[PDB]
Structure 1
Amino acid sequence: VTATVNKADKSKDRTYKTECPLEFYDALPRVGEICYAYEIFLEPQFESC
């Protein structure tokens, strides 16, 4: 923090390896194991015309 020249290029955007949440990790089903099926309910709200 005492240095000054370190901020001459402060626009240096940081790059990261993205990752998935816990439920998304290793969720690919295999043969012979019980998995979960999540139905997607939806509700159209626009006027019926």
Structure 2
Amino acid sequence: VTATVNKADKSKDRTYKTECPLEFYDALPRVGEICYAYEIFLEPQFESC
């Protein structure tokens, strides 16, 4: 904060890293190990023509 001259280029933007969630962090099955198949459902809400 003592660097009060920080108003010169306050429009500067920086980069950041990204990371997948813990569950998605290497959930790949191993041969011989238990696997969880999570079913996907697509229920229609709109009434069709």
Shorter-chain TM-score range: 0.7 to 0.9
User: Where does structure 1 lack aligned partners over 5 or more consecutive residues?
Assistant: none
- Aligned partners of 2:14 and 2:27: how far apart in 1? 29
Q: TM-score, normalised by structure 1?
A: 0.78
Greater Cα shift, 28-37 or 7-16 = 7-16
User: Where does structure 2 lack aligned partners over 5 or more consecutive residues?
Assistant: none
Q: CA RMSD in A?
A: 1.3
Structure with the larger helix share = 1
Tell me which stretches of 4 or more aligned residues in structure 1 moved more than 6 Å: none
Structure 1 residues 1-49: aligned runs within 5 Å? 1-49=1-49
After superposition, the C-alpha distances for 1:1-49 in whole angstroms (9 at most, x for unaligned) are 1222223111221211100111000111121111111011121112221
Give the number of aligned pairs: 49
Which secondary structure state, in structure 2, belongs to the residue aligned with residue 35 of structure 1?
Answer: coil
Greater Cα shift, 34-43 or 7-16 = 7-16
